[PDB]
Design a binder for this molecule. Structure first.
Ligand SMILES: NC(=O)c1ccccc1C(=O)O
Length: 159
């Protein structure tokens, strides 16, 4: 695994929009989106967010993330974390989170990163825990079927 990163580009959109594999996966990384995901929905998110970044290995875009909140001197909130199915479990999310932490520090002078994770996403909860994120609160959300879910709000200091 030899990873690099760069800002997302329009030519990346179809690849990245292909990463969520079902309605649940889309919900866990973009709960406002509607299944099926699309390039137009992804581009609309990018336009209203900051710091949209891809991770690349062996000439392939394998991961994407951005910030859905950003407050200079204060914090950023990581969003839209998506990884190519074949590249799951291989450190791509871990790598991108590190890159986004540096970007929050550098671009926003952030002292904290916030990550919100839906309760069903065990893999995310475990990874964010390995990376030093701590749970702070639990908020109620509703999934696309109107079922109540729990959004675990985590954070981590950035010095
Ligand atoms: N902004 C959110 O409500 C959210 C919550 C959990 C995971 C991802 C996101 C996201 O849209 O990026």
């Amino acid at each position: 695994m030899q990873l690099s990163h760069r800002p997302a580009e329009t030519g990346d959109l179809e690849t990245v929009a292909g990463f969520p594999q079902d309605r649940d996966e889309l919900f866990y990384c973009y709960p406002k989106a509607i299944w099926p995901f699309s390039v137009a929905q992804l581009a609309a998110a990018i336009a209203e967010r900051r710091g949209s970044t891809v991770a690349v290995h062996d000439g392939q875009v394998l991961g994407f993330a951005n910030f859905y909140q950003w407050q200079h001197g204060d914090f950023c909130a990581l969003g839209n974390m998506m990884v190519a199915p074949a590249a799951r479990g291989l450190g791509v999310a871990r790598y991108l989170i590190g890159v986004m932490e540096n970007l929050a520090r550098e671009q926003y002078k952030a002292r904290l990163m916030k990550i919100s994770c839906f309760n069903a996403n065990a893999a995310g909860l475990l990874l964010y825990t390995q990376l030093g994120y701590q749970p702070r609160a639990i908020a109620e959300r509703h999934d696309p079927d109107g079922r109540r879910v729990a959004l675990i709000q985590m954070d981590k200091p950035l010095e």
